[PDB]
Amino acid sequence: ADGVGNASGDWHCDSTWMGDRVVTKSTRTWVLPSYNNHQYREIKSGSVDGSNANAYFGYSTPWGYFDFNRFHSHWSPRDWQRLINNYWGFRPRSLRVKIFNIQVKEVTVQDSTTTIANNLTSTVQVFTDDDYQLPYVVGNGTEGCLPAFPPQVFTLPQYGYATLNRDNTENPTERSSFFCLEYFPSKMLRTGNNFEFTYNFEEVPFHSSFAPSQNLFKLANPLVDQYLYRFVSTNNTGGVQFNKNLAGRYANTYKNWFPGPMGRTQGWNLGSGVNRASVSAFATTNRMELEGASYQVPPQPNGMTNNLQGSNTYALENTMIFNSQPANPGTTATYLEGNMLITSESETQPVNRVAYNVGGQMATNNQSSTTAPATGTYNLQEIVPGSVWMERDVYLQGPIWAKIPETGAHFHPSPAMGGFGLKHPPPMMLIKNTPVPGNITSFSDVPVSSFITQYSTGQVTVEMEWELKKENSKRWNPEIQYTNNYNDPQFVDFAPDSTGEYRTTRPIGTRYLTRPL
Amino acid sequence: ADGVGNASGDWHCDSTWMGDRVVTKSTRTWVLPSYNNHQYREIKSGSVDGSNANAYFGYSTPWGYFDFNRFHSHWSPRDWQRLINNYWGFRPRSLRVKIFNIQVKEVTVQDSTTTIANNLTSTVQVFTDDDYQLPYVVGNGTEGCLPAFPPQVFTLPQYGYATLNRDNTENPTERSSFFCLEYFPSKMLRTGNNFEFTYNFEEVPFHSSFAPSQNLFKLANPLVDQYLYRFVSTNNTGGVQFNKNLAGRYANTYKNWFPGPMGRTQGWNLGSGVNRASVSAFATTNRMELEGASYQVPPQPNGMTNNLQGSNTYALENTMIFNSQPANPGTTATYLEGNMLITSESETQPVNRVAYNVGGQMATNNQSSTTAPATGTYNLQEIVPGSVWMERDVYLQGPIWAKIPETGAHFHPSPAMGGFGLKHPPPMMLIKNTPVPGNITSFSDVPVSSFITQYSTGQVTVEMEWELKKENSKRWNPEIQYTNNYNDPQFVDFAPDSTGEYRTTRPIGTRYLTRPL
């Protein structure tokens, strides 16, 4: 029933499209190193690369964690296409995770033989953090998620966190906190044991995957004039003059609604664009301040568009930039446009303001008979009553959710990188190898530092349920679809290479179907 | 309830996607001329344009008919896209037609005033031919269908047919038959009256809209060898030698299945292809014989592909060729490639043989010590046991169904032009204006030849139900979709022009999703 020669799970990887629901099942194989050699280590940094915003104080743990938070973990490229071409929206309903077929392997080294055997009596520890009492590291856009491609085996990331540091240095504060993860009740698993967990997502709005089919400022009827008048000019006396707003003149018409917030970020020309030679580009990025340090915010807040339709100019600090292939840890290499997957928000340009331009102008003075009217442009503007914008699009390579920070107050909790802001997101699932001491022949009151070196492996299946929003549209002519289109392909995209390396050439977002404002 | 000031129907134009069903409703406005001036006229022709296959004998009638038989009558360009991108097949389940809001208009001419008034007492006659007793003219690819675009008003075609003629001349036979359409019971309708009809399609196979994802002859595993051997050669003595069939050598492997039938038609190079100058091209087309005359068959039989993938060469006598815009009756103008919508069957090239090449070769002799083996190519081959092919694709601009001719025998009744072969297709719905005599002050035994000139108009709604075949596929990577893609468009396609003229630039077929053999 439960033992060494009986499998504790099966491989469920599949998708089931039923009505407005869809359930996606994905199973992967993982391997867990024994991190720190069963130690909690205090990690810290001072200012590096000329910035004291890189200073931190924190801890690294023996534990490791499961990260479900990228879309390609749950979705096939063909299932993502079926979703984005056919639907106006989706949101996650529920989640359940299972960890099974555990294998603990003891490794030994004598004169460089390095033999490996399996320890049938050894245990692994697993707990889920249901009450959100640990620092939540998942939604921050870091590596270690289940692979995009099911055959791939992956290592679990090491768990660690940064607490408060003092005066932008590597030293701690009195409010720097240490969290022991052994002080949670956890479940201990041998080979025949398995683990199961179930979670229900809180109510969130649908991700709206459509593009606006109208301009925000062109919403008026082009055939009929307005009954509203505008101040046109003033005669040779100071007397003021008025004209009627006519038909399709959209510069002059009255508006109910206004674009979303903005801040200006530098545009850079990809491809044939000429740009400028030998820029260092760190000093001129947009920044914010905390605690006397200056941080780059590489996504900006929502309400802008990084690219304007078919132009070469991108903001690059308003963009999500991906690599076409995974990289080694700590790679300082320089990459070009061809190596990069550079997303475009230009499907939102009707309702959103371009990031590399000014946002408008306002009056800078009071006129008189003596002085003429004057204006000036503004490079930043924030939330205004009657504003409408679109949120950052979601990509198959991008994050599903984020956790809203726990403080007093927040506004419109939509993550800048993308996805769903969640007060109670899917909990963190943490796992470690239980230590097995080496040969100890004596009593000592100092803790045991000599352990059998070992690692564990197994399978994990995740099952998510998604709610779908049907596309109900009276558009007569055909729409834009995500299609598989390449001229003289030397390989097929989203498939293994001749070596076995899985290749993804281009990013895929959700906004294709079009809808009127 | 039923009268002049009460509408007898409503405008239903819509589509409802429910599960595997979809119902498409479309309403149009029609106008019916009074044809022949209420006369049956015997029409005939001798050999014209140098061909006695153009000779015929037949009759034209005062009647006119409703023709539902093109796909764009029932389908929007956006609904056709949703169909062909998401589904593996469809077939019609049921049909119902309604004719309502009848208006009869009397026209009079005095000294070129040409006034028009409405005759409230005048009638229109409508019958459906349920028993298939009339010549069925609908499925033959001729004009007069409900428009593609709902705002358009259309004239009903005049009903007529050709019977037997004698010795390829304009004269009749003893088996030439005359059908009076007054000798059917029909329903007479004034302004407040309406007509309704319901029909259930007989069981037919799904139109298979997918492309094959494998080659017919490449179905073997490329990794493993066959256990079968081939005759390779013979040594210096006549002794015969054999080799094993190896792995991925698909020229040499044994086959279970064979391509469909063929006949060779001349290929012609579109676009930059050089072709040949000043060809008359009628004498060299493929033909068949009946009754001592020679007819061009401009579609060929099924089982070939007109285009080979991205080549410029087309068969043009294996192709369905459409005009991007409707034309006037009897237009002798010459058209170029740009005016034409030229379909490609190349998605069937894995399973179907190209029409402009030979189909293979066979042994032409018996060898000996004296004579060497010889072969020769064949330009035509027909149905063979174990043949597999794909049927002609259906297009939004093309016919839905055809009627299988009533004879003793037939084989595989799939129409060459496309769609569904039907023993009992949707009946013909015939309509005429009832005659109103002019002023007759005397008795004569010769029939009344003087009538009030008048026409009628109204609305017709058609409602069809379609059964759908879900696409169930394990393909990992994305597929090809029909997308709305144009570089620097000066107009939007499948929408009215600045003048109001509805524009369709390109043909749309059903085969996009891919499936393995």
PDB file of N, CA, C and O in Angstrom, chain A residues 49 53 55 121 186 196 217 238-239 266-267 272 279 294 301 310 331 350-351 353 358 362 370 398 409 418 492:
ATOM      1  N   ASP A  49      28.860  47.932  -7.152  1.00  0.00           N
ATOM      2  CA  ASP A  49      28.625  48.538  -8.458  1.00  0.00           C
ATOM      3  C   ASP A  49      28.249  50.012  -8.315  1.00  0.00           C
ATOM      4  O   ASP A  49      27.475  50.552  -9.106  1.00  0.00           O
ATOM      5  N   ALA A  53      22.036  51.136  -2.808  1.00  0.00           N
ATOM      6  CA  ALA A  53      20.779  50.413  -2.879  1.00  0.00           C
ATOM      7  C   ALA A  53      20.984  48.914  -3.023  1.00  0.00           C
ATOM      8  O   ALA A  53      20.039  48.153  -2.816  1.00  0.00           O
ATOM      9  N   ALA A  55      23.088  47.316  -1.064  1.00  0.00           N
ATOM     10  CA  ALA A  55      23.400  46.826   0.269  1.00  0.00           C
ATOM     11  C   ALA A  55      22.187  46.155   0.886  1.00  0.00           C
ATOM     12  O   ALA A  55      21.056  46.606   0.711  1.00  0.00           O
ATOM     13  N   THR A 121      15.652   4.888   4.215  1.00  0.00           N
ATOM     14  CA  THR A 121      15.178   5.287   5.529  1.00  0.00           C
ATOM     15  C   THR A 121      15.192   6.800   5.720  1.00  0.00           C
ATOM     16  O   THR A 121      14.643   7.299   6.706  1.00  0.00           O
ATOM     17  N   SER A 186       5.740  20.739  10.127  1.00  0.00           N
ATOM     18  CA  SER A 186       5.902  20.285   8.757  1.00  0.00           C
ATOM     19  C   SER A 186       5.679  18.784   8.695  1.00  0.00           C
ATOM     20  O   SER A 186       5.621  18.105   9.718  1.00  0.00           O
ATOM     21  N   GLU A 196      -0.040  16.530  -0.312  1.00  0.00           N
ATOM     22  CA  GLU A 196      -1.138  17.093  -1.088  1.00  0.00           C
ATOM     23  C   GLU A 196      -1.627  18.378  -0.434  1.00  0.00           C
ATOM     24  O   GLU A 196      -1.690  18.472   0.792  1.00  0.00           O
ATOM     25  N   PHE A 217     -10.032  59.601 -27.192  1.00  0.00           N
ATOM     26  CA  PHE A 217     -10.436  60.964 -27.488  1.00  0.00           C
ATOM     27  C   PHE A 217     -11.280  61.081 -28.748  1.00  0.00           C
ATOM     28  O   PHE A 217     -11.766  62.172 -29.048  1.00  0.00           O
ATOM     29  N   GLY A 238      -9.906  93.400 -25.785  1.00  0.00           N
ATOM     30  CA  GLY A 238      -9.719  92.132 -25.112  1.00  0.00           C
ATOM     31  C   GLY A 238     -10.888  91.162 -25.154  1.00  0.00           C
ATOM     32  O   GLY A 238     -10.802  90.092 -24.553  1.00  0.00           O
ATOM     33  N   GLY A 239     -11.974  91.494 -25.846  1.00  0.00           N
ATOM     34  CA  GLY A 239     -13.199  90.703 -25.824  1.00  0.00           C
ATOM     35  C   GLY A 239     -12.990  89.300 -26.369  1.00  0.00           C
ATOM     36  O   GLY A 239     -12.313  89.115 -27.375  1.00  0.00           O
ATOM     37  N   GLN A 266      13.194  57.260 -21.038  1.00  0.00           N
ATOM     38  CA  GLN A 266      13.948  57.521 -22.256  1.00  0.00           C
ATOM     39  C   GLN A 266      13.671  56.454 -23.307  1.00  0.00           C
ATOM     40  O   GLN A 266      13.716  55.258 -23.023  1.00  0.00           O
ATOM     41  N   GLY A 267      13.364  56.894 -24.525  1.00  0.00           N
ATOM     42  CA  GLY A 267      13.158  56.003 -25.652  1.00  0.00           C
ATOM     43  C   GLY A 267      14.462  55.705 -26.377  1.00  0.00           C
ATOM     44  O   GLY A 267      15.302  56.587 -26.544  1.00  0.00           O
ATOM     45  N   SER A 272      17.206  49.303 -36.889  1.00  0.00           N
ATOM     46  CA  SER A 272      17.953  50.265 -37.689  1.00  0.00           C
ATOM     47  C   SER A 272      18.061  51.636 -37.030  1.00  0.00           C
ATOM     48  O   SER A 272      18.732  52.516 -37.578  1.00  0.00           O
ATOM     49  N   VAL A 279      26.856  55.216 -24.450  1.00  0.00           N
ATOM     50  CA  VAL A 279      26.105  55.698 -23.296  1.00  0.00           C
ATOM     51  C   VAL A 279      26.268  54.699 -22.158  1.00  0.00           C
ATOM     52  O   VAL A 279      26.224  53.486 -22.380  1.00  0.00           O
ATOM     53  N   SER A 294      18.711  55.285  -3.862  1.00  0.00           N
ATOM     54  CA  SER A 294      18.069  55.578  -5.135  1.00  0.00           C
ATOM     55  C   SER A 294      18.023  54.309  -5.975  1.00  0.00           C
ATOM     56  O   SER A 294      19.066  53.768  -6.350  1.00  0.00           O
ATOM     57  N   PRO A 301       5.169  52.147 -13.425  1.00  0.00           N
ATOM     58  CA  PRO A 301       3.763  51.907 -13.090  1.00  0.00           C
ATOM     59  C   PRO A 301       2.896  51.766 -14.336  1.00  0.00           C
ATOM     60  O   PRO A 301       3.273  52.152 -15.445  1.00  0.00           O
ATOM     61  N   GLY A 310       4.276  50.665 -35.024  1.00  0.00           N
ATOM     62  CA  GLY A 310       5.359  50.084 -35.797  1.00  0.00           C
ATOM     63  C   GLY A 310       6.637  50.898 -35.779  1.00  0.00           C
ATOM     64  O   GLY A 310       7.473  50.762 -36.674  1.00  0.00           O
ATOM     65  N   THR A 331      25.737  35.592 -14.541  1.00  0.00           N
ATOM     66  CA  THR A 331      26.323  35.834 -15.852  1.00  0.00           C
ATOM     67  C   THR A 331      26.395  37.334 -16.116  1.00  0.00           C
ATOM     68  O   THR A 331      25.374  38.028 -16.123  1.00  0.00           O
ATOM     69  N   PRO A 350      -4.204  53.276 -28.015  1.00  0.00           N
ATOM     70  CA  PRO A 350      -5.375  54.168 -28.002  1.00  0.00           C
ATOM     71  C   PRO A 350      -5.698  54.758 -26.642  1.00  0.00           C
ATOM     72  O   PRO A 350      -6.061  55.934 -26.564  1.00  0.00           O
ATOM     73  N   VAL A 351      -5.646  53.964 -25.576  1.00  0.00           N
ATOM     74  CA  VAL A 351      -6.020  54.424 -24.243  1.00  0.00           C
ATOM     75  C   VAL A 351      -4.832  54.827 -23.367  1.00  0.00           C
ATOM     76  O   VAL A 351      -5.042  55.529 -22.366  1.00  0.00           O
ATOM     77  N   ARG A 353      -0.748  56.440 -22.731  1.00  0.00           N
ATOM     78  CA  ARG A 353       0.161  57.447 -23.263  1.00  0.00           C
ATOM     79  C   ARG A 353       1.572  56.897 -23.423  1.00  0.00           C
ATOM     80  O   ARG A 353       2.055  56.137 -22.586  1.00  0.00           O
ATOM     81  N   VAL A 358       6.326  63.780 -23.861  1.00  0.00           N
ATOM     82  CA  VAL A 358       5.643  64.570 -22.842  1.00  0.00           C
ATOM     83  C   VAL A 358       4.179  64.161 -22.810  1.00  0.00           C
ATOM     84  O   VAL A 358       3.664  63.559 -23.759  1.00  0.00           O
ATOM     85  N   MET A 362       0.203  72.765 -19.670  1.00  0.00           N
ATOM     86  CA  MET A 362      -0.720  73.556 -18.871  1.00  0.00           C
ATOM     87  C   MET A 362      -0.230  74.993 -18.796  1.00  0.00           C
ATOM     88  O   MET A 362       0.912  75.293 -19.135  1.00  0.00           O
ATOM     89  N   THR A 370      -0.564  93.339 -20.730  1.00  0.00           N
ATOM     90  CA  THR A 370       0.874  93.450 -20.930  1.00  0.00           C
ATOM     91  C   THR A 370       1.497  92.121 -21.344  1.00  0.00           C
ATOM     92  O   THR A 370       2.358  92.087 -22.229  1.00  0.00           O
ATOM     93  N   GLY A 398       5.795  35.083 -18.508  1.00  0.00           N
ATOM     94  CA  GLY A 398       5.762  36.011 -17.405  1.00  0.00           C
ATOM     95  C   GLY A 398       5.063  35.512 -16.160  1.00  0.00           C
ATOM     96  O   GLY A 398       4.524  34.408 -16.118  1.00  0.00           O
ATOM     97  N   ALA A 409      -2.178  50.911   3.764  1.00  0.00           N
ATOM     98  CA  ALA A 409      -2.947  51.388   2.632  1.00  0.00           C
ATOM     99  C   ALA A 409      -2.274  51.058   1.312  1.00  0.00           C
ATOM    100  O   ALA A 409      -1.060  50.883   1.239  1.00  0.00           O
ATOM    101  N   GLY A 418       3.089  42.234 -13.950  1.00  0.00           N
ATOM    102  CA  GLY A 418       1.890  41.752 -14.596  1.00  0.00           C
ATOM    103  C   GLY A 418       1.126  40.783 -13.728  1.00  0.00           C
ATOM    104  O   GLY A 418       1.595  40.390 -12.656  1.00  0.00           O
ATOM    105  N   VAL A 492      11.678  24.486 -36.021  1.00  0.00           N
ATOM    106  CA  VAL A 492      10.338  24.849 -35.589  1.00  0.00           C
ATOM    107  C   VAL A 492      10.443  25.452 -34.196  1.00  0.00           C
ATOM    108  O   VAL A 492      11.220  24.986 -33.356  1.00  0.00           O
TER     109      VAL A 492
END
